[PDB]
């Protein structure tokens, strides 16, 4: 027939695929590299710029930009390259033939949706498109109509309650902490152990170290006492060149800044106190049924032990007499995509698209009134 494309811009990884199947068949980092060093050899096939896995393969020579910072698209000329590369190289599909579904964090600036629509109609000529909240799609993914969704990727963290499919817009919280600024903190603590990572390539090395070795302490002060008193906790990783680095309390100490953002020096409280403050902004009749479903989403929630750390300190905040249930499926890194894959395959949803006629009639302003 014709089948929607489903795309999640995120920050860091792009993940894209066709609606109505179970995992994305293109995943790659949303990264654009431009070569900086003088090129000596003649007739090398040297190229303007590289996107995704090309840029990370060659990332020694390149400078690596991210075009999306804190879920805001900061540069458009790169982002058009990233979509062009996704459709033509990654999916090998002409976007005229398929409606497209696009994904975003809530409370980001209006003009992001306008430009993201305008580029999809004018340059791609996508026949119809929709833009959907990440958190909402995580419920379609985990199979619920009720819950408070805590979502963190790279860039933005946000919390949205939903009760029987009605969002409660006054209680949405957003926080800029997750993902990249954990890595920028990990650099700064690693310097204290004598290793220095500055370049954009080294930032990708630190990001891989974080993904392998970090884990969340059940109690932060007990484990700092242990790691001071012992070497038992200490793990070593081999850099690409074969130098080897050894890491102690820093590996649990890095993700603890999610719970105590004072380490990096933000104002606001950790994800648990924004979760509890979000439930507190909901009306008292529903609250039991948000406490009874908490849904974690996006890759920054993948750290081992983060689920029981949440359940443990939220329980300590919450009224004593209630279930706290933290739901964190192992698939959760892809949940926003899987939920959009489900949504775009509903039959009811086929009325929902912004069609090209409607854009020609109204201009990109329509996206605000038609979409959430």
């Amino acid at each position: 027939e014709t089948t929607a494309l489903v795309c999640d811009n995120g920050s860091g990884l792009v993940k894209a695929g066709f609606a109505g199947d179970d995992a994305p068949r293109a995943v790659f980092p949303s990264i654009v590299g431009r070569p900086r060093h003088q090129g000596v050899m003649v007739g090398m096939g040297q190229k303007d710029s590289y996107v995704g896995d090309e840029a990370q393969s060659k990332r020694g020579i390149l400078t690596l930009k991210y075009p999306i910072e804190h879920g805001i698209i900061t540069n458009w000329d790169d982002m058009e390259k990233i979509w062009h590369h996704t459709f033509y190289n990654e999916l090998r599909v002409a976007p005229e033939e398929h409606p497209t579904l696009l994904t975003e964090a809530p409370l980001n600036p209006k003009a992001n949706r306008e430009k993201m629509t305008q580029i999809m109609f004018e340059t791609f000529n996508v026949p119809a498109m929709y833009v959907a909240i990440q958190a909402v799609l995580s419920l379609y993914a985990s199979g619920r109509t009720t819950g408070i969704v805590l979502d963190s990727g790279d860039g933005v963290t946000h919390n949205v309650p939903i009760y029987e499919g009605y969002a409660l817009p006054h209680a949405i919280m957003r926080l800029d902490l997750a993902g990249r600024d954990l890595t920028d903190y990990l650099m700064k603590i690693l310097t204290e152990r004598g290793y220095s990572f500055v370049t954009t390539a080294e930032r990708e090395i630190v990001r891989d170290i974080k993904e392998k070795l970090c884990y969340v302490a059940l109690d932060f002060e007990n484990e700092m006492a242990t790691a001071a008193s012992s070497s038992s906790l200490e793990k070593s990783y081999e850099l690409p060149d074969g130098q080897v680095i050894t890491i102690g309390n820093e590996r649990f100490r890095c993700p603890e800044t999610l719970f105590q953002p004072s380490f990096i020096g933000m104002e606001s409280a950790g994800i648990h106190e924004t979760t509890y403050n979000s439930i507190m902004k909901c009306d008292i009749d529903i609250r039991k049924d948000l406490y009874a479903n908490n849904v974690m989403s996006g890759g920054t929630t993948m750290y081992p032990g983060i689920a029981d750390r949440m359940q443990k300190e939220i329980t300590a905040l919450a009224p004593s007499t209630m279930k706290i249930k933290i739901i964190a499926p192992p698939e959760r890194k892809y949940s926003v995509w899987i939920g959009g894959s489900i949504l775009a395959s509903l039959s009811t949803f086929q009325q929902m698209w912004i069609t090209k006629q409607e854009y020609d009639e109204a201009g990109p302003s329509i996206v605000h009134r038609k979409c959430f």
């Binding site: 910072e69 804190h70 805001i72 900061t74 600036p109 800029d176």
Partner: peptide
């Protein structure tokens, strides 16, 4: 962003 944060 446009004011507060850098992007």
């Amino acid at each position: 962003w446009x004011a507060x944060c850098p992007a």
